[PDB]
Amino acid sequence: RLMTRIALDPFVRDLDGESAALRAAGPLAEVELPGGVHVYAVTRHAEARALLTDSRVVKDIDVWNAWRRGEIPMDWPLIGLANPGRSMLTVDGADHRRLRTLVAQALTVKRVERLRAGIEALTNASLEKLAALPAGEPVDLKAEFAYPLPMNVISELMGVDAADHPRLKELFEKFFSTQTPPEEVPQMMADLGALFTKIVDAKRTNPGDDLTSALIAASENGDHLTDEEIVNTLQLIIAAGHETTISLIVNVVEALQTHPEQRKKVLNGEIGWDGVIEETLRWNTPTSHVLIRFATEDIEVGDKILPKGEGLIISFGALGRDEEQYGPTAGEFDATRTPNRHIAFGHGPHVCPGAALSRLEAGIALPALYERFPELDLAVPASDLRNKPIVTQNDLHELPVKLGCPFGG
Numbered sequence: 001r002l003m004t005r006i007a008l009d010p011f012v013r014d015l016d017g018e019s020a021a022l023r024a025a026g027p028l029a030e031v032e033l034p035g036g037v038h039v040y041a042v043t044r045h046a047e048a049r050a051l052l053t054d055s056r057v058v059k060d061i062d063v064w065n066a067w068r069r070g071e072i073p074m075d076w077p078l079i080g081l082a083n084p085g086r087s088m089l090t091v092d093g094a095d096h097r098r099l100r101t102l103v104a105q106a107l108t109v110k111r112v113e114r115l116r117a118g119i120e121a122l123t124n125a126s127l128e129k130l131a132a133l134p135a136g137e138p139v140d141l142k143a144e145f146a147y148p149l150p151m152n153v154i155s156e157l158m159g160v161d162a163a164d165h166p167r168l169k170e171l172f173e174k175f176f177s178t179q180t181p182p183e184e185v186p187q188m189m190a191d192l193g194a195l196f197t198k199i200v201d202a203k204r205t206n207p208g209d210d211l212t213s214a215l216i217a218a219s220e221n222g223d224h225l226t227d228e229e230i231v232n233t234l235q236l237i238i239a240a241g242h243e244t245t246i247s248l249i250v251n252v253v254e255a256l257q258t259h260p261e262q263r264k265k266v267l268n269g270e271i272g273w274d275g276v277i278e279e280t281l282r283w284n285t286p287t288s289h290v291l292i293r294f295a296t297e298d299i300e301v302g303d304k305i306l307p308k309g310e311g312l313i314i315s316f317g318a319l320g321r322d323e324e325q326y327g328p329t330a331g332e333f334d335a336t337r338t339p340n341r342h343i344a345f346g347h348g349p350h351v352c353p354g355a356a357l358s359r360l361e362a363g364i365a366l367p368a369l370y371e372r373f374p375e376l377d378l379a380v381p382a383s384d385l386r387n388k389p390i391v392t393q394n395d396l397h398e399l400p401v402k403l404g405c406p407f408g409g
């Protein structure tokens with residue numbers, strides 16, 4: 001019954017081809033994660049949503065056969081995604097609701113509107129650094145704009161100091177890469193954990209108006225989050241700032257630089273920016289695979305069975321171009337697509353609580369970019385953009401652009 005097992009390429013050489021093969025193998029495809037670990041992937045939309053709201057599908061790693069049997073090495077480069085420490089991400093039920101509420105409450109659409117002016121300030125400061133670089137030479141818009149801006153917005157929300165950014169960057173590049181030697185993995189996990197522990201100890205004795213301090217202050221407060229849950233939660237929040245928000249900005253520029261008719265309409269005001277962002281989230285999503293869930297008993301998925309104790313990944317890149325959900329134009333980027341009920345942010349109880357923040361950041365960064373630099377284009381052919389060796393995220397090595405001369409519109 002199952003089509004041939006798909007091995008996810010550790011080098012991410014052909015993400016679009018892999019995505020199309022996952023869709024054809026759906027709704028439940030056998031796959032191999034790098035390091036040789038067999039799991040199932042849900043690769044169609046309607047079945048992903050059903051699985052993500054099924055209480056028989058859990059985050060409890062002791063349910064996983066492969067873990068119980070000793071076949072997942074602790075120095076697997078994906079260990080940090082497959083077995084993260086206790087936090088809202090790794091529990092279900094009432095534990096989950098306790099561990100989520102405060103963070104979700106700080107990040108509603110309204111609490112996030114109040115960060116707008118602070119985000120506008122950091123965006124204009126990043127733009128002044130661009131335009132202050134040597135005119136006419138290519139710039140790497142990822143390292144000079146798309147990386148630093150979301151890292152600053154998220155650091156400021158959580159009160160991380162800028163002196164910690166260089167080591168965070170280096171550690172996160174190892175945490176996400178398939179090429180981190182197993183022998184390096186243990187010390188990377190210890191370093192990340194020691195660095196977040198140190199940040200949380202400092203905030204305890206030196207509060208700020210930042211969300212970490214608010215998590216700490218719900219202490220004399222029916223006990224609420226343990227020290228370890230706060231540290232693990234901080235780590236999880238800050239990993240977004242080195243990953244998904246950067247990718248959304250990069251992928252929006254890449255979509256616009258390859259669809260010149262829509263580009264023109266967007267810079268006009270005939271298609272709104274919000275729609276461009278939503279269609280990028282659907283069509284070229286920042287998170288290719290969401291790790292990882294486990295079946296507490298056999299589950300029907302289409303005509304297949306997800307067996308008890310097996311692992312499940314959600315293949316969002318694949319299912320973002322699902323014709324059953326969006327019709328026969330599902331394959332194409334169309335920024336006016338209107339029912340666009342993608343699940344780039346997940347679905348069910350673990351649905352991204354930061355989604356409104358990421359929309360607000362990209363919705364400010366991107367108009368400000370192209371208002372200041374209305375002839376922005378890629379300095380390389382679009383086909384020469386390449387993915388980093390990060391099997392679960394859709395990230396580019398560089399986004400070389402010609403800014404092409406400031407102001408106006």
Ligand code: HEM
Pocket residue numbers: 088089090100103107236237240241244245248286287290291292344345346347349350351352353354355357358
């Ligand atoms: C474009 C940006 C982003 C994308 C695409 C994204 C995507 C995701 C997805 C798919 C999940 C679900 C994981 C699962 O079901 O196992 C998730 C969870 C999460 N995201 Fe986001 N995310 C983004 C930005 C952010 C931001 C800015 C924050 C800031 C706080 C954040 C915090 C979280 C947290 C804490 C969870 C765990 C929620 C839970 O388990 O209840 N993310 N994200």
